[PDB]
Swiss-Prot record, chain A:
The keyword Protein biosynthesis does not apply. This is Chaperonin GroEL. Forms a cylinder of 14 subunits composed of two heptameric rings stacked back-to-back. Interacts with the co-chaperonin GroES. Can form asymmetrical complexes, composed of one GroEL and one GroES, and symmetrical complexes, formed between one GroEL and two GroES oligomers. The asymmetrical complex is the functional unit. It was suggested that the symmetric heterooligomer may represent a transient intermediate in the chaperonin protein folding cycle. The gene is groEL. Keywords: Acetylation, ATP-binding, Chaperone, Cytoplasm, Isomerase, Nucleotide-binding. During the substrate-folding cycle, the two GroEL rings separate for effective substrate binding and chaperonin activity. Ring separation is triggered by ATP binding to the trans ring of the asymmetric GroEL:GroES complex and avoids formation of functionally impaired symmetric GroEL:GroES2 complexes. Activity of the GroEL-GroES chaperonin complex requires Mg-ATP. UMPylation of the chaperone by SelO/YdiU negatively regulates its activity, and may facilitate survival under stress conditions. The chain holds residues 139 to 412 of 548 of the full protein. Its EC number is 5.6.1.7.
UniProtKB/Swiss-Prot annotation, chain B:
Catalyzes the formation of S-adenosylmethionine (AdoMet) from methionine and ATP. The overall synthetic reaction is composed of two sequential steps, AdoMet formation and the subsequent tripolyphosphate hydrolysis which occurs prior to release of AdoMet from the enzyme. Is essential for growth. This is S-adenosylmethionine synthase. GO terms for molecular function: ATP binding; identical protein binding; magnesium ion binding; methionine adenosyltransferase activity; potassium ion binding. SUPFAM superfamilies: S-adenosylmethionine synthetase. Belongs to the AdoMet synthase family. One of its GO terms (biological process) is one-carbon metabolic process. Changing R242 to H/L: Loss of activity. Disruption phenotype: Cells are resistant to methionine-analogs, such as DL-ethionine(Et). Changing D14 to N/A: Loss of activity. Induction: AdoMet activates the tripolyphosphatase reaction. It comes from the Bacteria. K(+) binds at E40.
From Swiss-Prot, chains C, D, E:
It is found in: Cytoplasm. The keyword Nucleotide-binding does not apply. Together with the chaperonin GroEL, plays an essential role in assisting protein folding. The GroEL-GroES system forms a nano-cage that allows encapsulation of the non-native substrate proteins and provides a physical environment optimized to promote and accelerate protein folding, probably by preventing aggregation and by entropically destabilizing folding intermediates. GroES binds to the apical surface of the GroEL ring, thereby capping the opening of the GroEL channel. Regulates the ATPase activity of GroEL. (Microbial infection) Essential for the assembly of several bacteriophages. One of its GO terms (molecular function) is protein-folding chaperone binding. Keywords: Chaperone, Cytoplasm. One of its GO terms (biological process) is virion assembly. Belongs to the GroES chaperonin family. Heptamer of 7 subunits arranged in a ring. Interacts with the chaperonin GroEL. Can form asymmetrical complexes, composed of one GroEL and one GroES, and symmetrical complexes, formed between one GroEL and two GroES oligomers. The asymmetrical complex is the functional unit. It was suggested that the symmetric heterooligomer may represent a transient intermediate in the chaperonin protein folding cycle. Another study shows that the symmetric heterooligomers are substantially populated only in the presence of proteins that cannot be folded by the chaperonin. The modification N6-succinyllysine is found at K33. The keyword Cytoplasm applies. This is Co-chaperonin GroES. It comes from Escherichia coli (strain K12). The lineage of its organism: Bacteria, Pseudomonadati, Pseudomonadota, Gammaproteobacteria, Enterobacterales. CDD domains: cpn10 (cd00320). Pfam families: Cpn10.
Length: 274, 379, 95, 95, 95
């Protein structure tokens, strides 16, 4: 249970390398028990650890005119809305009510749709520049059924409801009850982060239990990895270990050793040590 | 046993050359019902060459056809080193033949003789619904899926160049699963490597291959070296007729090696193979056999076929003498007789140029309307 | 100066609006062509089968609602586009 | 105030009912656009061939049954969708 | 209840018989839609060119033979489909 034993197991499992064992123990302590730790090859000469708190997806802003903080090259929204849509967008006519309603309040709004065409981008950017309503647009992350699954996950965590055309829900009739909330949102060129959502907890436990039980029936370890990553993203944290070596051969050797140490530490936590 | 079939996309120079040759053939056939066409195409970096012997009473300019055809694949940019409009096409075709009046006289079209000597083969198995070997069929479907997605615009950074390899294992002569799936495709530089394989496997690999045939032992390979940005005619020499084995069956059936693209229906090197597949598909759809092949032989300057042989691999429900008897008295194997009953003299060879000449229901030679009659006769 | 013949009427349409039921600003294809205008001059009247002329119901200076179509022709006068149409294209009188 | 010309009437169609002979809710293509509405303003009357005017048979406040088509024109008045259509395009009067 | 306007009448089509000229019960597309019905109400009358009214020949309660086409419009009244049609589409009257 203690971090000393985990560090010792990781050290022994990596050909007596104390640095990787200590790094793995620290990462496991930071992330916790319900989380994902993965290893990717780095670019520097020494290993580094990067941990992500909350959830984030690899989707960025559509247009460079949304950034209100050019110093960091990223846009920050304070207490915004979240609008979830699965249909392609090419005309603004379906969002006049929601945009006018949220402009009547003042605090910002965020749009998560699978794709928005330039016709709506024009009105959105001109409205943001003229200082009437502050909005941002990000593409829906992923593809296929996984995309809708993670859209539902975002809806559950942010305390809102998804808007799907196939379930007979239209965006014209949407109102503030169908929009979620979040403490802060940070969007850069490649990632979008939702910070401290206001969803109900029991829904969170229900969703994580559903995905956890769905893990069992999966036959490919790739699907198991994806669903475990989804569980960690919805609840918990995700950490990545970037191993560093001068040459590609040493890179592969160190990566294999670190993966072996990770597996050994996981098994020791699960069952115990002798 | 472990067998692998490989298919290529329409953006490859050889497939580009094949498409050009068949596009000209359809245009010539549309203008001239009874033209003679024997053409070949060569494509390189910025230079396109066409040649052969085409004897027809009509005239067609090849420039507008080539630009229209190349634009169809999607070569409308100079980023890959080949653009439709910026390129140049030259003609090296002899539009006239000395023998246009000496041999104009004909005795009887129904007794026309074969212009070539050789033996042709057919093949058909009930492993797939399309009556075709599975590994080649699914390899064609994968690259077909990639083009449809690329044309749909949902995946705009994909490039025409793509290659797929599918591996199938057989236990007691039956399919039991999928071993390894490889899809090699060219992409734009904006998207990183990690996001690249995720899109292709979940939208091309996933909704095409059967789910019940995929197990935990299946291995998915995407971009083995890691960077397939370089492609197009710049990276490889282009010429016509080099992968006939890929187009016909993928190696599961013995083939005569005769080139298909750029040839008129008059030559038996193309049409007679179509009839053999038509006969083989018909004789197997009736349930008379699990697999069957038709061996038809022709001699240059000889009208009547020398020999017709049928082989079944011992799966026949009736003696082979009955099988040979039925095909002779129910199928017209005449070199001109099969032309009339398969009505190939129509501008339909453009779509056949890519994605395999066989394995599509809409093709005239892939119909199974005669299967019911043979079942009654042999029953 | 242009004088229409018979029952035709020359109008000029209003500029397209920017704000739409609030602060939302529409640009490009979002803002459609205006479907209203003001009448500048009115025709003499419609020719009846009898031969008499029936004066047009629309008067100078009014505001009309019209439907664009093959009957409405766009003419540029004094570097300003004006619309020439019959009275049948006019649907209603505003205020 | 909007008043039509000749024999045109402006109507406002009723809302699309979801419940159908019970608590079942119809969505999508199951429920189509309504075909009943009430008149807001009535035209002066149709123009006869000789030149006389004939008063219309519809009074303000009646509920009418019409058929939507090419001749029916939709215009936005006071941020409310109303239909401008001829008197001959209505079928019957409810009650 | 509704009443038609001008030259329109409202009819209800009778049920199609199954046993035709004997015990042969017809099912499927063989039992074509009935082309005969009974009038429920009669319109005011067609407006002539001079403006007069010509009373309709059909009287309420009679049985009429008509042809189904584009001019016939169906309306859901009291959860019972009826037909809205002009007198020009009425072919004959039974008895």
């Amino acid at each position: 249970s203690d971090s000393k034993a985990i560090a010792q197991v990781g050290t022994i499992s990596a050909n007596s390398d104390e640095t990787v064992g200590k790094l793995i123990a620290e990462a496991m302590d930071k992330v916790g028990k319900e989380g994902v730790i993965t290893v990717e090859d780095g670019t520097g000469l020494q290993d580094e650890l990067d941990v992500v708190e909350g959830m984030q997806f690899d989707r960025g802003y559509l247009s460079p005119y949304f950034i209100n903080k050019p110093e960091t090259g990223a846009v920050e929204l304070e207490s915004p809305f979240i609008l979830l849509a699965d249909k392609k967008i090419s005309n603004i006519r379906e969002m006049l009510p929601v945009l006018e309603a949220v402009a009547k309040a003042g605090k910002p709004l965020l749009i998560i749709a699978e794709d928005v065409e330039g016709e709506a981008l024009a009105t959105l950017v001109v409205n943001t520049m003229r200082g009437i309503v502050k909005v941002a647009a990000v593409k829906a992350p992923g593809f296929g059924d996984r995309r809708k699954a993670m859209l539902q996950d975002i809806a559950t965590l942010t305390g809102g409801t998804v808007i799907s055309e196939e379930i007979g829900m239209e965006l014209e009739k949407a109102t503030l009850e169908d929009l979620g909330q979040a403490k802060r949102v940070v969007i850069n060129k490649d990632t979008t982060t939702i910070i401290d959502g206001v969803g109900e907890e029991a829904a969170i436990q229900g969703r994580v239990a559903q995905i956890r039980q769905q893990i069992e029936e999966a036959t490919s370890d790739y699907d198991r990895e994806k669903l475990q990553e989804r569980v960690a993203k919805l609840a918990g944290g995700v950490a990545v270990i970037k191993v560093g070596a001068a040459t590609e051969v040493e890179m592969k050797e160190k990566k294999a050793r670190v993966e072996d140490a990770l597996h050994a530490t996981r098994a020791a936590v699960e069952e115990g040590v002798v | 046993h472990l067998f692998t079939s490989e298919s290529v996309s329409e953006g490859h120079p050889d497939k580009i050359a094949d498409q050009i040759s068949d596009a000209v053939l359809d245009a010539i056939l549309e203008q001239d019902p009874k033209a003679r066409v024997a053409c070949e195409t060569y494509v390189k970096t910025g230079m396109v060459l066409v040649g052969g012997e085409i004897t027809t009473s009509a005239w067609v300019d090849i420039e507008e056809i080539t630009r229209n055809t190349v634009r169809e694949i999607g070569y409308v940019h100079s980023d890959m080193g080949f653009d439709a409009n910026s390129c140049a096409v030259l003609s090296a075709i002899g539009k006239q033949s000395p023998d246009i009046n000496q041999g104009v006289d004909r005795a009887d079209p129904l007794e026309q003789g074969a212009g070539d000597q050789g033996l042709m083969f057919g093949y058909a198995t009930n492993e797939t619904d399309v009556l075709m070997p599975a590994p080649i069929t699914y390899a064609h479907r994968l690259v077909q899926r990639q083009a449809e997605v690329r044309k749909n615009g949902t995946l705009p950074w994909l490039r025409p160049d793509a290659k797929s390899q599918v591996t199938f294992q057989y236990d007691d002569g039956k399919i039991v699963g999928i071993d390894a799936v490889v899809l090699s495709t060219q992409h734009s530089e904006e998207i990183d490597q990690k996001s690249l394989q995720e899109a292709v496997m979940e939208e091309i690999i996933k909704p095409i291959l059967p789910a019940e045939w995929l197990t935990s032992a299946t291995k998915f390979f995407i971009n083995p070296t890691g960077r397939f940005v370089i492609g197009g005619p710049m990276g490889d020499c282009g010429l016509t007729g080099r992968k006939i084995i890929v187009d016909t069956y993928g190696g599961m059936a013995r083939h005569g090696g005769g080139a298909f693209s750029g040839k008129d229906p008059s030559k038996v090197d193309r049409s007679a193979a179509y009839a053999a597949r038509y006969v083989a598909k018909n004789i197997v759809a009736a349930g008379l056999a699990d697999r069957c092949e038709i061996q038809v032989s022709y001699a240059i300057g000889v009208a009547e076929p020398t020999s017709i042989m049928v082989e079944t691999f011992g799966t026949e429900k009736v003696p082979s003498e009955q099988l040979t008897l039925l095909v002779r008295e129910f199928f017209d194997l005449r070199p001109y007789g099969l032309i009339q009953m398969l009505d190939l003299l129509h501008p339909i060879y453009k779509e056949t140029a890519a994605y395999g000449h066989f394995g599509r229901e809409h093709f005239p030679w892939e119909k199974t309307d005669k299967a019911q009659l043979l079942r009654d006769a042999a029953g | 100066n242009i004088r229409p013949l018979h029952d035709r009427v020359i109008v000029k349409r209003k500029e397209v609006e920017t704000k739409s039921a609030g602060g939302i600003v529409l640009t490009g294809s979002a803002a459609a062509k205006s479907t209203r205008g003001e009448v500048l001059a009115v025709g003499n009247g419609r020719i009846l089968e009898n031969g008499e002329v029936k004066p047009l119901d629309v008067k100078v200076g009014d505001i009309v609602i019209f439907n664009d179509g093959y009957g409405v022709k766009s003419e540029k006068i004094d570097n300003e586009e004006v619309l020439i149409m019959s009275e049948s294209d006019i649907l209603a009188i505003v205020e």
